[PDB]
Structure formats: structure tokens, C-alpha cells
Design an enzyme around this catalytic site. Structure first.
Site, PDB file in Angstrom:
ATOM      1  N   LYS A   1     -73.488 101.870 -20.095  1.00 28.41           N
ATOM      2  CA  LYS A   1     -72.892 101.885 -18.769  1.00 28.41           C
ATOM      3  C   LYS A   1     -73.560 100.805 -17.930  1.00 28.41           C
ATOM      4  O   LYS A   1     -74.777 100.611 -18.006  1.00 28.41           O
ATOM      5  CB  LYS A   1     -73.071 103.244 -18.098  1.00 28.41           C
ATOM      6  CG  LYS A   1     -72.155 103.535 -16.961  1.00 28.41           C
ATOM      7  CD  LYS A   1     -70.698 103.597 -17.427  1.00 28.41           C
ATOM      8  CE  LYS A   1     -69.855 104.140 -16.295  1.00 28.41           C
ATOM      9  NZ  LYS A   1     -69.731 103.131 -15.192  1.00 28.41           N
TER      10      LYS A   1
ATOM     11  N   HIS B   1     -52.137  96.559 -26.417  1.00 27.91           N
ATOM     12  CA  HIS B   1     -51.046  97.323 -25.824  1.00 27.91           C
ATOM     13  C   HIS B   1     -51.343  98.820 -25.899  1.00 27.91           C
ATOM     14  O   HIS B   1     -51.755  99.327 -26.941  1.00 27.91           O
ATOM     15  CB  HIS B   1     -49.736  97.007 -26.543  1.00 27.91           C
ATOM     16  CG  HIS B   1     -49.311  95.574 -26.414  1.00 27.91           C
ATOM     17  ND1 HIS B   1     -49.668  94.605 -27.331  1.00 27.91           N
ATOM     18  CD2 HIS B   1     -48.566  94.944 -25.473  1.00 27.91           C
ATOM     19  CE1 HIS B   1     -49.153  93.442 -26.967  1.00 27.91           C
ATOM     20  NE2 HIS B   1     -48.486  93.618 -25.838  1.00 27.91           N
TER      21      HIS B   1
ATOM     22  N   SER C   1     -52.343 103.474 -20.065  1.00 30.18           N
ATOM     23  CA  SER C   1     -52.087 104.911 -19.962  1.00 30.18           C
ATOM     24  C   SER C   1     -52.925 105.744 -20.921  1.00 30.18           C
ATOM     25  O   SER C   1     -52.654 106.937 -21.074  1.00 30.18           O
ATOM     26  CB  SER C   1     -50.613 105.251 -20.228  1.00 30.18           C
ATOM     27  OG  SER C   1     -50.163 104.772 -21.480  1.00 30.18           O
TER      28      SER C   1
ATOM     29  N   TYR D   1     -47.355 111.926 -18.117  1.00 22.73           N
ATOM     30  CA  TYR D   1     -47.242 112.505 -19.452  1.00 22.73           C
ATOM     31  C   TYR D   1     -47.005 114.002 -19.397  1.00 22.73           C
ATOM     32  O   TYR D   1     -46.375 114.556 -20.300  1.00 22.73           O
ATOM     33  CB  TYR D   1     -48.499 112.227 -20.268  1.00 22.73           C
ATOM     34  CG  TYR D   1     -48.542 110.839 -20.814  1.00 22.73           C
ATOM     35  CD1 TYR D   1     -47.621 110.419 -21.757  1.00 22.73           C
ATOM     36  CD2 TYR D   1     -49.490 109.936 -20.362  1.00 22.73           C
ATOM     37  CE1 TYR D   1     -47.648 109.136 -22.244  1.00 22.73           C
ATOM     38  CE2 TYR D   1     -49.537 108.658 -20.852  1.00 22.73           C
ATOM     39  CZ  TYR D   1     -48.612 108.263 -21.793  1.00 22.73           C
ATOM     40  OH  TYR D   1     -48.657 106.981 -22.270  1.00 22.73           O
TER      41      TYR D   1
ATOM     42  N   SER E   1     -60.143 101.750 -26.727  1.00 24.19           N
ATOM     43  CA  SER E   1     -61.037 100.597 -26.631  1.00 24.19           C
ATOM     44  C   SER E   1     -61.634 100.256 -27.991  1.00 24.19           C
ATOM     45  O   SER E   1     -61.862  99.084 -28.290  1.00 24.19           O
ATOM     46  CB  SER E   1     -62.136 100.842 -25.596  1.00 24.19           C
ATOM     47  OG  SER E   1     -63.118 101.741 -26.066  1.00 24.19           O
TER      48      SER E   1
ATOM     49  N   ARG F   1     -57.380 115.819 -34.106  1.00 20.61           N
ATOM     50  CA  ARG F   1     -58.470 116.163 -35.013  1.00 20.61           C
ATOM     51  C   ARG F   1     -59.726 116.588 -34.268  1.00 20.61           C
ATOM     52  O   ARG F   1     -60.372 117.574 -34.640  1.00 20.61           O
ATOM     53  CB  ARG F   1     -58.774 114.997 -35.939  1.00 20.61           C
ATOM     54  CG  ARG F   1     -57.775 114.885 -37.061  1.00 20.61           C
ATOM     55  CD  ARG F   1     -57.821 113.497 -37.621  1.00 20.61           C
ATOM     56  NE  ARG F   1     -59.192 113.069 -37.871  1.00 20.61           N
ATOM     57  CZ  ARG F   1     -59.892 113.355 -38.959  1.00 20.61           C
ATOM     58  NH1 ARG F   1     -59.363 114.034 -39.969  1.00 20.61           N
ATOM     59  NH2 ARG F   1     -61.146 112.922 -39.046  1.00 20.61           N
TER      60      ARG F   1
END
Lengths: 508, 510
Positions: free
Chosen positions: B135, B218, B222, B271, B393, B468
């Protein structure tokens, strides 16, 4: 509390903040000349003032601090977490340079303050390093040899991985709680792991054992520079008369606070220079003798009995913390910071104070004595930088991969004998009789003893003298009187600033 | 004041964030330790020996490994200079690179970056992302700087971090956070590639959150919201917990109150509105709006976009005592703002049956305890449910190492294979029944085929991981009879993975 009063009024000021106060006094002397020396036809005066102000503003704060935590298993098999820090105050020159403490005292603010002082020390002695400082927060006396080695090797790896250990980036050195065996372990760990392709791996650290690339003349260097610093100023009648002293070091009485390495070698060199060390004040004792203590006898007696107390050639001075307020020509503070503060400066009867310790005199106490007009304070960042100078020589020796004099001692000796025989030949022809021309006893002794330490000593003395003279010229030029500390800071800040200005900084 | 910081953690009104995480860690450590000892194969160690080694490893995991602090000058646009401070924490290096975002904020402190770097370690482990946690922060208010000054600060921290091993594709890969976005991310990647990393084949893998043209991926924008949805989905399908908390299965029909309409709250509401929930409340820092029939996410975002706020949104009412909307009855409460939003002094007023911690540390240990004893609240923990972005990421980092976008060498190949397969079925079906019998993609399949793109691979990967990990949390909570303490189950799973790295790398001696 106290830390709202002005800095020249503080009783227990922060170390780093009092160094910043000394910085500001020095920046103030020098900034007019700096704005004046900046020349752009595309810069307005405001542009030039802002740029000078901005470089000075950048120099003050510590550039970088690495903080790490890591586990170790103690010899008993259990697990413990250790903290460590490494501050790099200035990278205007790399590598950075400065010691590693093993102490429970170590804190981030402490490594910051001393790394900053390291920057100004190195600049004072023309040593091309920014300042750095590190610490491991342990009481080393609580650990076995094997535990100390595990901790030492782990900080070497972790520091080195992040650019906080390496001959071109950051070169540490001993400090409180560490010594040459820890430096040898760090050097080996570096050479064996993340520096195993580094041609100059042993230049990653100084204060190494001789067999690992250490340098001769290291152990006494700081003490020898304090002597040479005192010598540079004692030869000056202007300052000697204003403080009521006669010139030269022979005859002067010396009270030394601390019989650690620096106090002992200062005593050694001062005693060896004709001074009387009339008082030794230590952390729990003080012996005094208006005849002077002999440093060998006292080192031996301290070796033998474990303490300077009851020293057969010295009364115990009781109220032993007050030996420093006793009458002396020179006081040599060689213990902790802020030893002469707001509340005791006026009791100091010393006419010269040679700051062998880092930050012995608070800004508050500095003021009282300067206004008193009869005290010459030789500042820490000049007078205690003899070791810094020799550490530069040790780094160079490791980059050179050869000891000093290896390729010159015999060559030079033979040349000198050939020169002396040429003079003897010429003299016997001119006067028509036998007339031997040989080294006198002193020259013969230096020829016979010629060794790397002689080259180190000469180099140290050359630097201490030149740096001392530059501090004097600056004080004189600005009519700074006995405020050699402001002169010294102006000289150091100027060197750092001029590095930035020719590199062309800004690009951030 | 600080009399609080003396009570047991579960009694504290305003605990430190890092102290919260460590207390939550200790709960997971306690459950999992006996199994960890078991996992230690060594014929040379007694069981006493193994318990000691495990406790040493857990002792090493909790504190942040490394913090770099820097100061540097910058020239403001008018010609005067200012010194700037930044930090980067690497909590765990048991796997490298470390991973974590960079804030440009006045709130960034050494301790917040530490607390959130540790959380990152456990988040990454939760979603099988092979990074330790990191961080960073630069201590500025970015809206007080011009674009030029922000770019100078961004390029300088890229240089200084990278020189010391706090930026690079194999050492530490940052990302956006409060005060930064993809343009700073692209500036860091370019500075890295042009200076310290100019011989790095994978220079663009030094940072994630990049613009697409610079190697971004891509589906990033979201992703955290999509993961909050899928984490809520995995739990809403379980009757053992939906019954205990008084709910029917499935998200369709559930009422939702979301605290915060930043990126995470907005994409969660999209969503969840899709998938059939009713978002009946949106609480922001100065407003609340409510509509017991559900608020449409696109109308709301437009209205905020045109006027500057959700106030007076025509498709809802303004809810006043606006800071009290999160206490109104709902099926699901999604805290999506700041930490410690639910605490000792307000936990009892939460009427939500399910809290989905979209934000980091929204529920203090005091409140977590208060709501566990009530027996009717299922908290889905932050380090699992808000880790959809971390997952994507990791995919962005892999794309940069791959030097190609996902599907570039498979979309047409698999499409043509799928048509040949369907044509083969058609030929077989026409021969056996003796008439024309077309066999084609149905409308859903044909739509997926035509729009096939990298986002679809990213979404499928995200969903696979969320499911999972969510199932492994449930299995762990069942095995240890943790009830609805899913958090402790999650830390136990996270700790076990980190510990096993240490165990096989070996810590027996050092």
C-alpha cells in the site's frame, strides 16, 4: 511544553530540530551570495530567490528512510521480531555514508537527525558522500555471538535488496553497539549473496577488519582529528585572546567528558601534544588531577580495574557530574547529545569547547556562551569528522584493490637514498673531505616505519587543516566572531547546494 | 480520550484499523493452528517443535515487512518549490511482487498504509492471487494541483520508488486508489519504462489500472462491484445461512441499501439491480435517497452527473436524517464508504440481514461481536467480498507479461470450431430424422459469440475465483462450526496459504 518556546529558548529540544536550527543560521549567511551567483537572463530575481530557497528547502529534510521488521530464532529455539531503520538524508552525492547502531535508543527521528549531520560533516571534509544513519533496536549485550551474527547478516540482505547497502549506493560503518566484526559479517554477506557479482563488494561497508579490506589508522582517526581541529584554532591569537588564552596546545588544561574511544584517543593525542588532561568525567565517576592524568596509565588502570575511579594517579572528583563545570582551558564533550543545555551553559568555565560528540551543545546553550564573548566552540560537524575522512580512504582502498603504499614505499625509499647519496657526493667534492649525508633520527624512523597508517594520517591532517582554514575565512568574512558553527554550516550547505545547481535539479 | 484503546478489542469504540485486522487475524490463526501443525511434515521435529515453528511463522506474518518513506522537492507552476512526502508499505514478501494501490490524499499516514497493506496480503491470499500485500500514499490533496504538477509528482515517485525496489513487475506492482486513476497509472508505467526500467521486457507490468492503450485490461472498472455481486450470490444460494438470518434464497427481490455512490457502490448497484435485487436506499456523505420500489442505477447516475448530486433525484425521495438510512430495514446492506462505519455505538440499529463489506474495514470488532451474538446477521467479510478488483489486477499483470490481450489467438479459432461442431450435429440430426433440422446458436449463445472479447475472459475468470473462494470459506466455517462468522473462516483460509509458503520455503533456521 518546552517545545513551543523558540529553539534558542528550548531546554530539551529535538535533536533533528536543533540541527535544522543550525542549518538555518548557516543558510541565512550564505543565501545572498547564492542568489547573486545565479545568472540566467531568463530568470527574474523572484525566480532566482525561489530556486535558491527551494534547493535549501530540499537539503534540510531526510530524502529516504527504510524501515524493516524480520523474524529471528533465538539460540533457545523461540521466535522474535526485530526492528531496524536506515536513513539516507541526502543523495546529492552517492554512496551515502554513515554508521549502524545496535541500541535500544534507536528511533526514526534519531537516525534522521544523525544522517543529516552526516551530510554536513562529509561536506565539511570534502568527502563525496551524502549522509546516512542506521540502527537496529536491540540491546546487543543481551544476545549471543551467534544471535548477533544472525541479526547482522539479515539486515545486510534486507538493506541490500532495497538499495540501502552497496558500494555505490550506501556504505555503513560502526557505531554504538557494533564494531569491525559486524562490518566483516555484513561485507561477507553482501559479497556472498546479492553482491556476488560486485567487483568491489568489500567497499560496501567501512570499519572492516584489516583482513577483510579494513584500513590502518581507523581506530584513532576521530581522536586525531579533534586534536588537529583544536590545533588549527589554538594557533590563532585573534580567537585565543578574545577567550583569554595563550596560543598553542602545550600547557592547556583539558577536561574530557567520556573515556570511550573518542575521548581516550583525544586524551592520547592531546596528552601526546603537551596538554594536561586535568579531568576525566565519566557516566558514574570522575577523576581529576591538576597535574593531569597519563592516558596510558589510566587506560591500563581502567583496563585492569574496570573503571577510572580510584585511579592511583587521580583523586575521585565527587559531585562527579560537575567536573565539566570546573575551570579548564578546553572542555572536550565526548558522551551524549545535549550535554551543555539551557540550564548549565553559564557554569561552563571552559574557554574552548571542542565538540567531539555529536550535538553536545543545544542552541540555547550555544547562545549564552556566544553572548558571553569568551568561549570558542569548535563545532561537531567539523572537529569530529576525522573518522569520516578515514572512512572515505577505506572505501577508496577497496575500490583500488590494494593497500596504500604497496607500490610506492620501496620505490620512494630507494629514490630518497639515491638523492641523499647525490648530495653527499656533491658535498664531499665541494669541501674536500668525508662528509656523510644520511637521514636524521626522525627521518630514519619514518622511513623504517613507513606503512599505510602514515599515508592515512597525512591525508587526515591535510583535510582537517584545509577544512579548518575554510571555516575561519568564512567566519572572518562575515564578521561571525567566535561563531565557528555558523561558518561551518554555511560552508557545508554551500557545497551541497552547488552540487544541485550544476546537476540542474528541479526535475521531479 | 484513549481510555478506549485499553478495552479489549471487541469492546473498543474507535480501535485502530491495524489493531482491528490483527485481532481478526488472531481469530483465524486460533482456528487454523492445529491443522497448520499437522501440515508440518518433519520426522526430526516433535509436536512441541512444530507448534513453536508455526507460532513463529504467524508472528512473522502479522507485522509489515518494509516501509519506504521519501521526501522530494517539486517546482510548482509559478516557480517556487515545495517538499512532498510519500510512503510505500510492503506487508508481506512471502510472494513477490507485492500488490496494492497508491492514494493521493491528505489522510494517508504510515499506519493506514500499513493496516491496508496487511489487509491486501490477506485479500490476495483469499482470491489465490500470488502477491504479498502493499500500500502506498502521497500526502497531498490532488485537487489543489494542476495537471502539470500532478504529473511531476507522479513521475518523481515512480523514479524514487523504483530506485529502492518499491516499483517493478517482479517486486511491487501498484494500482489506483483514492486520489489516483488510470492516467497516473499510465504516467508511472511510462516513467518506469523510460528511466529505471528501460531494459525491462515487461515494463508495462510494473503497475495495474493502466489505460487500455498502455496495456490496461478490459473489465477492470466494474470488477470490484462485479465481485461484490458474485460474493453475495454465492451466499444467497445457501439455505442454512439464509434461513438462520430470516431470508429466502437468491438475490432477486432482495432489498438493498448501499452506503456510498463512488465507483464501488455504483457498480455494485448496477450488478445487483441487474440480477433482480431492489436497491431501495443510497446513502452518501451529505444525502440519502430512498424509494421502496427500487432506484434505477442508470437514471440515478445520470441525474448525479447532470446536477452534481443524488439529491432530489426524481425517481426517489430524499431521506432525511440522511446519515440514518443504513439503519433502515433491508435485506442487504452494502457499506461502500469509509472504515469503521459500523461500530460499537451503532451496531444494534443495523436491521440488514446481510452486510456485504464492499469497503475496507467498515465493521469494527466491537460491532462484529455485537452482530454475531444477535444470531441474525451474515457479514460477508471485506478481504473476500471486495477482492474482485485484486483478482482482475492479477489478470492485468499477466496480460502485460504475456504481451498479448486475452483471446487474440483463440476467439476465431474457437468460433469456427463451435460452428463446425454445430454443423456436425445438424448433419447427424438431419440424417436420423429425415427432414431439415437447423442447429444454430440460440439467441444467448449467438450474442456471446458476436461480442466475444477480453472482458468476457476477465469476467469468467473473476466469477470462477469468487465462487471457489466463497465456497472454501463456507466449507471452513462448516468444518469449524463458526456459524455465520464467515470472517474468521476467511482469515483462517488466508493465513493457511501464507503459512504454507513459509513452511516449504523453509524457516527452520535463520
Amino acid at each position: 511544553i518546552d517545545d513551543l518556546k523558540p529553539m534558542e529558548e528550548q531546554s530539551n529540544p529535538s535533536f533533528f530540530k536543533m540541527v535544522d536550527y543550525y542549518f538555518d543560521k548557516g543558510a541565512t549567511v550564505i543565501e545572498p551570495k547564492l542568489v547573486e551567483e545565479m545568472k540566467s537572463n531568463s530568470m527574474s530575481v523572484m525566480d532566482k530567490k525561489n530556486l535558491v530557497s527551494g534547493i535549501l528547502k530540499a537539503i534540510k529534510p531526510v530524502n529516504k528512510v527504510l524501515y524493516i521488521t524480520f523474524p529471528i530464532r533465538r539460540d533457545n529455539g523461540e521466535f522474535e521480531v526485530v526492528e531496524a531503520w536506515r536513513a539516507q538524508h541526502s543523495e546529492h552525492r552517492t554512496p551515502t555514508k554513515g554508521g549502524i547502531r545496535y541500541s535500544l535508543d534507536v528511533c526514526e527521528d534519531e537516525v534522521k537527525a544523525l544522517s543529516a549531520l552526516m551530510t554536513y560533516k562529509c561536506a565539511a571534509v570534502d568527502v563525496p558522500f551524502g549522509g546516512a544513519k542506521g540502527g537496529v533496536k536491540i540491546d546487543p549485550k543481551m544476545y549471543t555471538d551467534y544471535e548477533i551474527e544472525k541479526i547482522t547478516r539479515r539486515i545486510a540482505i534486507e538493506f541490500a535488496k532495497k538499495g540501502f547497502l552497496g558500494p555505490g549506493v550506501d556504505v555503513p560503518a560502526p557505531d554504538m553497539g557494533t564494531g569491525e566484526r559486524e562490518m566483516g559479517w555484513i561485507a561477507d554477506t553482501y559479497a556472498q549473496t546479492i553482491g556476488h557479482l560486485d567487483r568491489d563488494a568489500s567497499a560496501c561497508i567501512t570499519g572492516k577488519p584489516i583482513v577483510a579490506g579494513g584500513i590502518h589508522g581507523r581506530v584513532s582517526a576521530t581522536g586525531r582529528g579533534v586534536w588537529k581541529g583544536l590545533e588549527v584554532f589554538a594557533k590563532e591569537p585573534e580567537y585565543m585572546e578574545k577567550i583569554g588564552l595563550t596560543p598553542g596546545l602545550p600547557g592547556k588544561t583539558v577536561i574530557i567528558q567520556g573515556f570511550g574511544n573518542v575521548g581516550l584517543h583525544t586524551m592520547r593525542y592531546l596528552h601526546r601534544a603537551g596538554s594536561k588532561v586535568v579531568g576525566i568525567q565519566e557516566w558514574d565517576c570522575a577523576i581529576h588531577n591538576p597535574a593531569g592524568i597519563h592516558p596510558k596509565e589510566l587506560e591500563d588502570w581502567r583496563d585492569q580495574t574496570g573503571s577510572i575511579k580510584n585511579f592511583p594517579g587521580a583523586k575521585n572528583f565527587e559531585p562527579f557530574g560537575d567536573l565539566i563545570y570546573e575551570a579548564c582551558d578546553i572542555l572536550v564533550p565526548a558522551a551524549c547529545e545535549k550535554a551543555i543545555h539551557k540550564e548549565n551553559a553559564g557554569r561552563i568555565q571552559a574557554k574552548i569547547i571542542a565538540e567531539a560528540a555529536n550535538g553536545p551543545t543545544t542552541p540555547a546553550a550555544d547562545k549564552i556562551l556566544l553572548e558571553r564573548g569568551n568561549c570558542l566552540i569548535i563545532p561537531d560537524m567539523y572537529v569530529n569528522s576525522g573518522g569520516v575522512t578515514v572512512s572515505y580512504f577505506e572505501w577508496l582502498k577497496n575500490l583500488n584493490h590494494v593497500s596504500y603504499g604497496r607500490l610506492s614505499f620501496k620505490y620512494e625509499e630507494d629514490a630518497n637514498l639515491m638523492l641523499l647519496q647525490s648530495v653527499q657526493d656533491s658535498l664531499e667534492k665541494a669541501i674536500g673531505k668525508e662528509a656523510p649525508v644520511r637521514p636524521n633520527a626522525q627521518f630514519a624512523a619514518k622511513i623504517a616505519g613507513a606503512s599505510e597508517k602514515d599515508i592515512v594520517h597525512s591525508g587526515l591532517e591535510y583535510t582537517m587543516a584545509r577544512s579548518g582554514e575554510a571555516i575561519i575565512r568564512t567566519a572572518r568574512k562575515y564578521n561571525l566572531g567566535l561563531d565557528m558553527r555558523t561558518a561551518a554550516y554555511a560552508n557545508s550547505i554551500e557545497k551541497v547546494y552547488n552540487t544541485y545547481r550544476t546537476a540542474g535539479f528541479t526535475f521531479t
